[PDB]
Design a protein around this ligand. Structure first.
Ligand SMILES: C[C@@H]1O[C@@H](O[C@H]2C[C@@H](O)[C@]3(CO)[C@H]4[C@H](O)C[C@]5(C)[C@@H](C6=CC(=O)OC6)CC[C@]5(O)[C@@H]4CC[C@]3(O)C2)[C@H](O)[C@H](O)[C@H]1O
Ligand SMILES: [Cu+2]
Lengths: 217, 217
């Protein structure tokens, strides 16, 4: 997929992390890969670059604690981070470096990212509860439905409606850490038909636990 | 170096022009090339390159984005700001290592006031089986963002144990939506009747209200 990283989830403190970046549509023979991360809610941060010829430049800071290495044949860059601290909790993104000369280069394509939570806790799968209008009012020509996703750890979660078919009027309310666990919800508005016997479903895939439960409304 | 972005937040009506600034601690300009870049990070996606080397446009980013500047001072102009650009904006220099980002300038598109469509949801059967009860209200598609909901339980008894989450600004119409979850124990949900969700937002002195009566328990 143009650049996708896997490495993920929960990693306990002091242990090591390897996030693998898999590039597509170019090769490492000709392209550099930056690694960046984004610590929840604040700014983007550069970790390092592995240039074309297997060469590397590092953010003097993290410097000591990380290595990046490519297998050109496999189309993968790998970032090894060791002695994890809890503030390494971040979204980790790999990006393509288009270099043509010192006066024409770009960090031009970005991976989706993967969420790495450094903590001594255990993943907790979500409980998913459907929410449907129950006291019968002649709901106009549109009805709202929802899925409540409760108590999971760590982040992320993915809530899709009828596997992805409805992403029209889908609202995804962001996640709130309550007593060490996260909760979130999503609403969808479908017509008064495309609900009753059309059967709606939210499909919640909670990666770290490998939960992928579909609750039918 | 270190990059300073102003304003940190910005609201501009459509058709207007927005001007993100970014000033560096040092001349990120070697010969006639200002080594700075501009990224658009929409709400929950990876960064998209907008401009590299201060002025050059990334193919695909429309021509209402303009980058300008030399040395220390740089500027991103977006005119006409269309609804689609409600996102967060970063500038990054690459004059030296490390490759630091500036803090982000959020853009918020000003729009006409829009009042909420409140929806109220019972708990699921499945939830009650875990001994708990959640009552959910989606206050959807309003502008501005400031809204404050209240839960009224059975009489004008208010409650605490409420979870309130706001979606970011919608990119099609410039609205916001909200989720409010009152979470009770089953064993106290069970011995009460009325549950109101009373929302108060600029568009009316009158709070909007949705409410249900526990119907055949
Ligand atoms: C022809 C050559 O060009 C100029 O020097 C150049 C080499 C060197 O000095 C630097 C600063 O260290 C290089 C640096 O090395 C590599 C980069 C960090 C790299 C990356 C960008 C990114 O995103 O990831 C990595 C690509 C360009 C870069 O950003 C800078 C750009 C500023 C420059 O100043 C330019 C002078 O004109 C010089 O005298 C002449 O020898
Ligand atoms: Cu400094």
């Amino acid at each position: 997929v143009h650049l996708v990283q896997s490495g993920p989830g929960l990693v306990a403190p002091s242990q090591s992390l390897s996030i693998t970046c898999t590039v597509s549509g170019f090769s490492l023979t000709t392209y550099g890969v930056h690694w960046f991360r984004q610590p929840p809610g604040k700014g983007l941060e550069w970790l390092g670059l592995i240039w074309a010829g297997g060469n590397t430049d590092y953010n003097s800071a993290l410097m000591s604690r990380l290595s990046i290495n490519k297998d050109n044949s496999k189309s993968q860059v790998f970032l090894k981070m060791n002695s994890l601290q809890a503030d390494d909790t971040a979204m980790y993104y790999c990006a393509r470096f288009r270099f043509a000369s010192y006066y024409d280069y770009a960090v031009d394509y970005w991976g989706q990212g993967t969420s790495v939570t450094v903590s001594s806790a255990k993943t907790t799968p979500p409980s998913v509860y459907p929410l449907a209008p129950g006291c019968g009012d002649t709901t106009g020509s549109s009805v709202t439905s929802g899925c409540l996703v409760k108590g999971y750890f760590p982040e992320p979660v993915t809530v899709t409606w009828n596997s992805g078919s409805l992403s029209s009027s889908v609202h995804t309310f962001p996640a709130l850490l309550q007593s060490g666990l996260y909760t979130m919800s999503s609403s969808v508005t479908v017509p008064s038909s495309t609900w009753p016997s059309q059967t709606v479903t939210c499909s919640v895939a909670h990666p770290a636990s490998s939960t992928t439960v579909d609750k039918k409304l | 170096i270190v990059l300073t972005q102003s304003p940190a937040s910005l609201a501009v009506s459509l058709g207007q022009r927005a001007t993100i600034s970014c000033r560096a601690s040092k001349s990120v300009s070697t010969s006639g090339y200002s080594h700075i870049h501009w990224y658009q990070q929409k709400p929950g996606q990876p960064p998209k390159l907008l401009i590299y080397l201060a002025s050059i446009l990334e193919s695909g980013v429309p021509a209402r984005f303009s980058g300008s500047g030399s040395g220390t001072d740089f500027t991103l102009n977006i005119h006409p700001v269309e609804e689609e650009d409600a996102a967060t904006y970063y500038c990054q220099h690459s004059r030296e290592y490390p490759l630091t980002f500036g803090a982000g300038t959020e853009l918020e598109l000003k729009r006409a006031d829009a009042a909420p469509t409140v929806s109220i949801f019972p708990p699921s059967s499945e939830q009650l089986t875990s001994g708990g009860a959640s009552v959910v209200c989606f206050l959807n598609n309003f502008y501005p963002k400031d809204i404050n909901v209240k839960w009224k339980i059975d009489g004008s008894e208010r409650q605490n144990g409420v979870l309130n989450s706001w979606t970011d600004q919608d990119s099609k119409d410039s609205t916001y939506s909200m989720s409010s979850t009152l979470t009770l124990t089953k064993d106290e949900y069970e011995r009460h009747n009325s549950y109101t969700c009373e929302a108060t937002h600029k568009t009316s002195t009158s709070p909007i209200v949705k409410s249900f009566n526990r119907n055949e328990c």
